[PDB]
Amino acid sequence: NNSIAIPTNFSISVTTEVMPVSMAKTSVDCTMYICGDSLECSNLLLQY
């Protein structure tokens, strides 16, 4: 109740912090993935 601790010297420290910001932008196509080059499959896909 009557003792304190006071520092007499100091130091300068540099720390690194890495943060993600963005990711890859991906675009898909329903054609040439679901049916490919096939007119018969593409005809049935028009309802979706």
Binding site: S27, D29, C30, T31, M32, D37, L39
Partner: protein
């Protein structure tokens, strides 16, 4: 317009599907075997067992 299914298009950029190229030719390649195996012997044999 066919990709976005609309007649009026807003200003911007859009990815488009394939509606441009269509095949117009046929290429058939079979092996050149000319011998005719007998359906007159395995079917119309003398006596089935």
């Amino acid at each position: 317009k066919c990709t976005i299914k609309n007649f009026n298009v807003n200003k911007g950029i859009y990815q488009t599907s394939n509606f441009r190229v269509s095949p117009t030719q046929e290429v058939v390649r079979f092996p050149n075997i000319t011998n005719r195996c007998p359906f007159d012997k395995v079917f119309n044999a003398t006596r089935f067992p």
